[PDB]
Amino acid sequence: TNYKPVANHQYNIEYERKKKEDGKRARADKQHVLDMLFSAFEKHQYYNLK
Amino acid sequence: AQLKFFEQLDQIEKQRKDEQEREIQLRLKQKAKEMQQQELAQMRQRDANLTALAA
Amino acid sequence: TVPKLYRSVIEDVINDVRDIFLDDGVDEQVLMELKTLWENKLMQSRAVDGFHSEEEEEPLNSEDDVSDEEGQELFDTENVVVCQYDKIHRSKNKWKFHLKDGIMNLNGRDYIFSKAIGDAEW
Amino acid sequence: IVPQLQNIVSTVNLGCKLDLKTIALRARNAEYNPKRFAAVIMRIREPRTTALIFSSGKMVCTGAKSEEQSRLAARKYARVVQKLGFPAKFLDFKIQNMVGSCDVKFPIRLEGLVLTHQQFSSYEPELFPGLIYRMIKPRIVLLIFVSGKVVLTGAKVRAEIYEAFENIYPILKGFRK
Amino acid sequence: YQLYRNTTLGNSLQESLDELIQSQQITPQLALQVLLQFDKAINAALAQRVRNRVNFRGSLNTYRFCDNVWTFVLNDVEFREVTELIKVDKVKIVACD
Amino acid sequence: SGSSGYKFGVLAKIVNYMKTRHQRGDTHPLTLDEILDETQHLDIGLKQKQWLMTEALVNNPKIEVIDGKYAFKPKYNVRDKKALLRLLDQHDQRGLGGILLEDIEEALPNSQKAVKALGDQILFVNR
């Protein structure tokens, strides 16, 4: 019934994703960000925070 | 210039189809597609700029 | 097999921008001027043959000159390689290069690779 | 046996705000990737040393194998930064940690040491092969492998490493196979 | 990536365009649109025919890495591919992914 | 999605950058063409340029024109950050509802004007 696995298989899969890609990166280029930010607003008056 | 005006007029003819389409959204889809590229273009601009600076 | 790819790409690009020139506004003559201007520069350079061409805490300066010449890095004629990287990993002093889709100009000749693997010590 | 120093981690304040992106583009041998880490990693060949230069002006230098070599390497890193043109100062070159390695030259029984010294020594075979003898009077963490190589870590000054070796020398000789 | 514009191919193109711009034969903005088309085309063209590859060996010098791009300057080394030897006293290597 | 010219955010950006360079002490009336010039964004396209000038700066409910040149409309008083007693001094509206949100960033954080403001009559309650 009980095996001897070292790293759970599910845990090992998330590790590669988080290491490969970081969801939030540099806190930098304020001017650059605004443009990215303004553009989204054109499509919609309302977007959820996430 | 009047031929160009006629071409512009065709524009309004097909914008009628656009309304009927919405009444039935292609323009909206195109706009959405255009919105998506902006971010990729900026990313290319930063990395591309860095490459230009390098050489 | 390289002049061929270039012709191939020039043709495709020219064909693919025709409508843009037209939509933007431009006579097809301008398009042909582009092709001519473009083909001609390569012929003038003569790097290869083309079908078109044939037609104390402060006195820090007390420790200086450690840096070498920055200007040595740029010649403007230096063999320039354009490629993409998959992973570049160096362990200790070993640098390993895992590259792809590259166009090389070595000793004057032009080469291409889908993958390139290299090693170097720094 | 005399232990030999293998790593000096030193921290020095340049004194002013630094723009990291500008440093990466002009300095040679420099990598600054924001997603993985927030600092410029700069490496020099003449004295082997890898230095993280932080954005707020604090610099940490690593990889030097002696005290004078670390101070000299930190000064070299500061001067490269200055030649770019940012205002530069050198303050508090203070060593943080020094790792030293030595060999007793005789086989040692780790299991026995745990039996008579359970209070200061912790050993688990599965997690790591070597016993850790954290020592309180001279604050140092010493890792002893079965073969006999002892690595001493966490010493503020050169001396501390030498006194911990004197104490460990005879205790190991008692547990020598 | 506007990466491949300063290449033989890309520069001959820009020069040709500038002329047309100079003679008002061809103009700007449109020129930008053409370059944009070029970027898409050269990226796509590169990953096409393939069937080529090169192992190289070297002794480094400078290195640089920014947001996504390595630029080296390997020197005094010879690279042999398919029994062909290339001798370089100074080589600059740029990879932008 | 109605009518869109060039890149989105040109308006909410032109006004702001002005809402910024002027506060940064660069105080002087300007025009949309001058803003494109200084921002090196002149190549926004004549159509968009025109649409911005005629409409974007017409649909703005608080934009100020004497004539040629657009002016800031958020505060009637120049953001001096000092000597408001006359406004403060006036006793016909119990201090005229002073706004903290308008205050700050003219050339200093209010925590500097206020202390003198604390030193002087100026009294502020963060209710």
From Swiss-Prot, chain A:
TFIIF is a general transcription initiation factor that binds to RNA polymerase II and helps to recruit it to the initiation complex in collaboration with TFIIB. This is General transcription factor IIF subunit 2. The gene is GTF2F2. It comes from Homo sapiens. It is found in: Nucleus. Heterodimer of an alpha and a beta subunit. Interacts with HTATSF1 and GPBP1. Interacts with URI1. Interacts with GTF2B (via N-terminus); this interaction is inhibited in presence of GTF2F1. The lineage of its organism: Eukaryota, Metazoa, Chordata, Craniata, Vertebrata. Belongs to the TFIIF beta subunit family.
Swiss-Prot record, chain B:
Transmembrane segments: none annotated. It is found in: Nucleus. Belongs to the TAF4 family. Component of the TFIID basal transcription factor complex, composed of TATA-box-binding protein TBP, and a number of TBP-associated factors (TAFs), including TAF1, TAF2, TAF3, TAF4, TAF5, TAF6, TAF7, TAF8, TAF9, TAF10, TAF11, TAF12 and TAF13. Component of the TFTC-HAT complex, at least composed of TAF5L, TAF6L, TADA3L, SUPT3H, TAF2, TAF4, TAF5, GCN5L2/GCN5, TAF10, TAF12 and TRRAP. (Microbial infection) Interacts with SV40 Large T antigen. The TFIID basal transcription factor complex plays a major role in the initiation of RNA polymerase II (Pol II)-dependent transcription. TFIID recognizes and binds promoters with or without a TATA box via its subunit TBP, a TATA-box-binding protein, and promotes assembly of the pre-initiation complex (PIC). The TFIID complex consists of TBP and TBP-associated factors (TAFs), including TAF1, TAF2, TAF3, TAF4, TAF5, TAF6, TAF7, TAF8, TAF9, TAF10, TAF11, TAF12 and TAF13. It is linked to Intellectual developmental disorder, autosomal dominant 73: An autosomal dominant disorder characterized by intellectual disability ranging from mild to severe, developmental delay, speech delay, behavioral abnormalities, and non-specific dysmorphic facial features. It comes from Homo sapiens.
From Swiss-Prot, chain C:
It is found in: Nucleus. Changing S67A: Strongly reduces phosphorylation. Eliminates phosphorylation. DNA binds at H89, R90. The modification Phosphoserine is found at S62, S67. Transmembrane segments: none annotated. The alpha and beta subunits are postranslationally produced from the precursor form by TASP1. The cleavage promotes proteasomal degradation. It comes from the Eukaryota. Pfam families: TFIIA. Changing S62A: Strongly reduces phosphorylation. Eliminates phosphorylation. TFIIA is a component of the transcription machinery of RNA polymerase II and plays an important role in transcriptional activation. TFIIA in a complex with TBP mediates transcriptional activity. Belongs to the TFIIA subunit 1 family. PANTHER family: TRANSCRIPTION INITIATION FACTOR IIA SUBUNIT 1. TFIIA is a heterodimer of the large unprocessed subunit 1 and a small subunit gamma. It was originally believed to be a heterotrimer of an alpha (p35), a beta (p19) and a gamma subunit (p12). TFIIA forms a complex with TBP. This is Transcription initiation factor IIA subunit 1. The lineage of its organism: Eukaryota, Metazoa, Chordata, Craniata, Vertebrata. The gene is GTF2A1.
Swiss-Prot record, chain F:
One of its GO terms (biological process) is transcription by RNA polymerase II. The modification N6-acetyllysine is found at K7. GO terms for cellular component: cytosol; nucleoplasm; transcription factor TFIID complex; transcription factor TFIIE complex. Residues 1-79 bind DNA. GO terms for molecular function: DNA binding; RNA binding; RNA polymerase II general transcription initiation factor activity. It is found in: Nucleus. Keywords: Acetylation, Disease variant, DNA-binding, Nucleus, Phosphoprotein, Transcription, Transcription regulation. It comes from the Eukaryota. Recruits TFIIH to the initiation complex and stimulates the RNA polymerase II C-terminal domain kinase and DNA-dependent ATPase activities of TFIIH. Both TFIIH and TFIIE are required for promoter clearance by RNA polymerase. Belongs to the TFIIE beta subunit family. It is linked to Trichothiodystrophy 6, non-photosensitive: A form of trichothiodystrophy, a disease characterized by sulfur-deficient brittle hair and multisystem variable abnormalities. The spectrum of clinical features varies from mild disease with only hair involvement to severe disease with cutaneous, neurologic and profound developmental defects. Ichthyosis, intellectual and developmental disabilities, decreased fertility, abnormal characteristics at birth, ocular abnormalities, short stature, and infections are common manifestations. This is Transcription initiation factor IIE subunit beta.
